[PDB]
């Protein structure tokens, strides 16, 4: 009977008048928060004026031109080429086609294999699911399609053995070199990864990881792609997660965080090297020119402008981010069954564990996470479980009072969670 | 710089006040025509009120519920299960995954091959391009992905030899039986086809074709899938092209015709048998419940309501359709280098040919269509060239005056085109 009635800021309300804290910002994407009535006006105006632009005209729709110009002001130097899509999933599928076409154009038609990671998520298309490494997605299908390979994820809690996180980062990155050499560098087109793995559980790699991944890609002349599905548009305090981790990808993909989810959209941001190679090839020219639904572009422009002009991204970096990260660690580090408390900017997580001292996970990874999640939900807090990882990505506009409000509810729920563990003898 | 400034009804206007006739309704999809300010109000209202619906609630967004209920009132019996997407390309990719999962659930994981047609078009994803039969899309890669096969298209003008269209329909459909038997029925999941091939040049199959295709699919336990990317939402005078051709697909895919292109959207309409088979599996349940961007759904609802309530689809069947078809044939049948004048409802075409009597096509199929297309554009009429086929699919609301206006401009260009052939000695 429970229906959602409205949203404002970080809150949702139901038909019974109950306030719900959205600690996940819809699908990790409602970065400016709920209730942006100004976006509705942007959509209305664009649709009344010119919701279409026909290819009969050799020019680009002014709404799309304006969006691309704003994006160029906020994206790293050298990403003047943007190919618009309808979603993060389509962005990934397009990027796969682009990376393969680039090598064809270069006269290296064998260079077609993309390398991803286990527990990596890259959307839901046949191609994206194949690049992804989600156990259940490959489990129930014909995946992966040819020319896809996977390396283990940089999850220190599980795989670190006796290494420090920094030592482990180097070893985890070197799995890419090992895989490139196993396949043959001349068969490898790209490595693709989320700066922080989102759906996998907010797996935050060690500081040593991305620099070594980047060194390895450059050494073997393999393209480097960041999937900014979740880290894009201010989530880490930088505009894009790759900026936080300090690597410089050749292309990066974006999902509906581009519009804070208010209309469906995505994009592939294409760097100078690949853009020039594809422009010589010619078969993405239609897309580079005529991609982007004008009404969706108008909403995304309003959203990106708000992110910049209202100082929202800067505020994550300098203000609410450090506050959230400190408070997050203060709140959860004391629990007997919580470990690997982690996060940066406005994405954060922890893992529910059987025994901290032994780094021992619960068996049937996910059962305990579901149990904890159900408690959060009963208490009108949205934070999700990915296996036994608990994850949070609230709207970036969250105030310190709202941070503290959310944490107080979560803290109460964790106390309940541990009581239920003990009472069922699983502790 | 020639820029588009506005659209109304069947007309587009440029920056220099020129009135252009859109004989193609955007991407074959602007079915209610341009200037629908009421669609803008629907989008505004939905975005102000509730543009999101969170999975925290186990209910469906009211705008999506309302859209699905309306669609069920106009779609064929048995398609109560709809899975929304952002585009026709995503619909196809989703449909491929569904068809494969359905057989997985039935305990037949070997039944994975989908059969399409040469010159068939099913969107731009890796999966869709592989199912499609566009030669250039394939060799611009290492498509198709595995588990895809193709049969020849039912194009009588080229492949009919000395059969009548109806004899040829049976022959062209039996190519499917041949391919199923070659592969083995136990390895074949589905046959997929556009009721009329759109991008392939409005190839209209003989009346005998679809019933034979259906007989074959049912005999060999192969699913039958209609791609309604272009035939959908009133184009043939029926709601869907499969209804015109009198076949019952097990699933069918839709593109942004669902919203007349005003916002990006698509859908997979899933028949009772496949829906029941998937609901047992459980892994499209999230999509079946939570698919559909609510703002896009509100615009699509307004569009589908207008198509029904303003009598637009019925008018194609009983009124403007017959008129267009009669006038089209009256206008083009007389020309020396025009043959196979064809169409139904508001989709129509012809083929530019070297010699009618010999059914001889121009060499380098495409050069000639382009030169005819160029004349059309110079005279501010948008009709598309697919190889040497000239195609038209105007907004369904086009009036008799506008039909005659359009054909008058087309006639002048064809009168011109043939004069230009001789002057080059290509005639």
Author numbering:
A (entry chain A), B (entry chain B): 33 to 459
Sentences from the paper on this structure:
The crystal structures and inhibitor complexes of two industrially important ω-aminotransferase enzymes from Pseudomonas aeruginosa and Chromobacterium violaceum have been determined in order to understand the differences in their substrate specificity. The two enzymes share 30% sequence identity and use the same amino acceptor, pyruvate; however, the Pseudomonas enzyme shows activity towards the amino donor β-alanine, whilst the Chromobacterium enzyme does not. Both enzymes show activity towards S-α-methylbenzylamine (MBA), with the Chromobacterium enzyme having a broader substrate range. It appears that the different rigidity of the protein scaffold contributes to the substrate specificity observed for the two ω-­aminotransferases.
Attempts to crystallize C. violaceum Am:PyAT with a small excess of PLP (100 µM) resulted in the structure of the apoenzyme. C. violaceum Am:PyAT elutes with an apparent molecular mass of 100 kDa on a size-exclusion chromatography column, which corresponds to a dimer. This enzyme is found to be a dimer in the crystal, with the asymmetric unit containing one (apoenzyme and mCPP complex) or two (holoenzyme) dimers. Significant structural rearrangements accompany cofactor binding in C. violaceum (CV) Am:PyAT, as also described by Humble et al.. This includes unwinding of the α-helix (residues CV 317–322) to form a loop covering the PLP phosphate group. The N-terminus (up to residue 36), which is disordered in the apoenzyme structure, becomes ordered in the holoenzyme structure and occupies the position of the unwound helix.
